From a paper:
Equilibrium binding assays indicated that all variants bind αvβ6 with low single-digit nanomolar binding affinity (KD~1 nM). As a result of comparative imaging studies in vivo, R01-MG emerged as the lead translational candidate. Furthermore, x-ray crystallography studies confirmed a disulfide bond pattern consistent with the cystine knot motif. Competition binding assays demonstrated that the N-terminus imaging label, located ~20 Å from the RTDL integrin-recognition motif in active loop-1, did not adversely affect the tracer’s ability to bind αvβ6 with high-affinity. The half-maximal inhibitory concentration (IC50) values for the unlabeled precursor and FP-labeled standard were 0.61 ± 0.31 nM and 0.56 ± 0.46 nM S.D., respectively. [18F]FP-R01-MG-F2 was evaluated in pre-clinical models with either human αvβ6-positive (~3.5 %ID g−1) or αvβ6-negative (~0.5 %ID g−1) tumors.
Cystine knot peptides (knottins) are small (~4 kDa) peptides characterized by three threaded disulfide bonds arranged in a topological knot; this stabilizing core motif is known as a cystine knot. Solvent exposed loops, that can be bioactive, extend from this knotted core. Here, we describe the development and validation of knottin PET tracers that selectively recognizes human αvβ6 with single-digit nanomolar affinity. Three cystine knot peptides (R01, R01-MG, R01-MR) were engineered for stability, and high-affinity molecular recognition of human αvβ6.
Numbering used by the authors: 0 to 36
Amino acid sequence: XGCILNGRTDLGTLLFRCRRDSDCPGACICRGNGYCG
């Protein structure tokens, strides 16, 4: 697998700065803005 950032309407994504997918929690991936999703 899951990804705690999928499907949320807060700014949880902004707690997870990423430069690559492996910076992200669970099976989340790094998105175009440099934060996980």
